[PDB]
Homo-oligomer: A and B are copies of this chain.
Amino acid sequence: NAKVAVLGASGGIGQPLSLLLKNSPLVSRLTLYDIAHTPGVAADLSHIETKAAVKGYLGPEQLPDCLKGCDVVVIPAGVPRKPGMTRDDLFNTNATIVATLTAACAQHCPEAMICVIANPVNSTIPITAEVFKKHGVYNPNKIFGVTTLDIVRANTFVAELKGLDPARVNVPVIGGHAGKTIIPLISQCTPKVDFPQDQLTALTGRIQEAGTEVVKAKAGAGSATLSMAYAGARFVFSLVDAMNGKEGVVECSFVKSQETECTYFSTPLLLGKKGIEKNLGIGKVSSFEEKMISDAIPELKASIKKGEDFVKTL
């Protein structure tokens, strides 16, 4: 029954993400939007033997037709990192992209769940919320910064070191999605795992800089796309199941938060029919994890304020 729009469907993330959505029985209609190539991408995907009806839309003229009646909107639309850059370096391009696309969402599908993949997530969620406020349809239970890839990485790396099946592993990751703002709560990992402090520090750093590690590995050919398609699909599926009344669906996501000093913050969230059913908070943490939370807050606030400031200028 779910109608899902992918804004930026023709890109590195957008195409495999759209493939995973098309493959799912949770999706009945898939609308694809981009400024280039969408008709070809949609034609391609429309041949797949699943029930989701696929349609491609090209350029701002066809954006309203893409968004009409949407339950979920996922937004990988943006520009990726080159080696050396921070996610923040992308602000001046993606801020405008996110502001433009979310403005269309506020106008044409204000009740949809808005899932922002476009970086820097720490600032693009603040932008999304302010754009919705300006249009008078701000619902903080329906706006999500997709940080799922951090959790997915943490699970993989913990499983590698301990020789576990990654599907059996769950590591809560909190804070935001940039360098030190990525805080993996290894103390809260299921199953219980014990690492020496030096291993834990390297593991923590490995998780924090994993995006940069992939950017380096690609050597100028973009950033994480396939693993991000996986994580984005995972988050959308969790959300859609929750919207269909499945109980106990928990995902971490960068959202409007009162858990800390920061106006936006990522914690585990009980999802449901209203979107965010309950923010489960940070919970019990180690001293090591407590310090990381403290050290990250200054950056998060700066990133939050930057996105808010940007929206003032429009």
Contacts and interface: CB of A to CB of B under 8 A. Distances in A.
Interface of A: 15-16, 18-20, 22-23, 25, 35-37, 39-51, 79, 82-86, 89, 92-97, 149, 152-153, 155-156, 159, 165-167, 169, 210, 213-214, 217-222, 224-227, 229-230
Number of identical protomers: 4
Contacts of A95: 84
Chain A interface mostly:
helix
B227 A152 contact: no
A39 B23 CA distance: 27
A165 B37 CA distance: 28
A34 to B, nearest CB: 11
Interface centre among A18, A35, A42, A85 (most CB of B within 10 A): A85
Contacts of A39: 217
A165 B51 contact: yes
Contacts of A18: 226
A156 B46 contact: yes
B165 A230 contact: no
Given A35-B219, A167-B49, A16 B93 contact: no
Contact of A218 (B40, B156, B214): B40
A44 B217 contact: yes
A204 B86 CA distance: 33
A51 B92 contact: no
A167 B24 CA distance: 11
21 contacts: A16-B19, A18-B226, A40-B219, A40-B222, A41-B218, A43-B218, A47-B153, A47-B214, A48-B152, A48-B156, A49-B155, A49-B167, A49-B169, A50-B167, A51-B166, A51-B167, A79-B85, A83-B93, A84-B96, A84-B97, A89-B93
